[PDB]
């Protein structure tokens, strides 16, 4: 989660 979104917004 490149964000912090709990996404995994290119990352985990």
Same mark, same amino acid.
């Given at each position: +989660?490149?964000? /912090? +979104? /709990?996404?995994?917004?290119? =990352? =985990?």
């Amino acid at each position: +989660d490149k964000n /912090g +979104d /709990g996404e995994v917004s290119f =990352e =985990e």
